[PDB]
Amino acid sequence: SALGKLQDVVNQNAQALNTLVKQLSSNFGAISSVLNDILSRLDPPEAEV
């Protein structure tokens, strides 16, 4: 634990990046979290939404 002060910095940034990446799996109200799935199914007038 002696170098916890340095490890904490590494952990906080790794955690921040992991969270940022995980957010890509969220729908946010969309039919899918995957942009390619939306584009393959819907036409622009609906895909845009």
Binding site: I31, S40, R41, L42, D43
Partner: protein
């Protein structure tokens, strides 16, 4: 079937050409939801219920 007792047909393990239906002159209504009627032949489904 009567609408109160509608008939469900399960469709699986096959090639689904939706252009035969969509480009037909014989239907008065053809409304697709959650999917474009012209992209159907590019998609794969785990099941279709008619």
């Amino acid at each position: 079937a009567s609408v109160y007792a509608w008939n469900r047909k399960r469709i699986s393990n096959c090639v689904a050409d939706y252009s035969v239906l969509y480009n037909s002159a014989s239907f008065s209504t053809f409304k697709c939801y959650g999917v474009s009627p012209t992209k159907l032949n590019d998609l794969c489904f785990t099941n279709v219920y008619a």
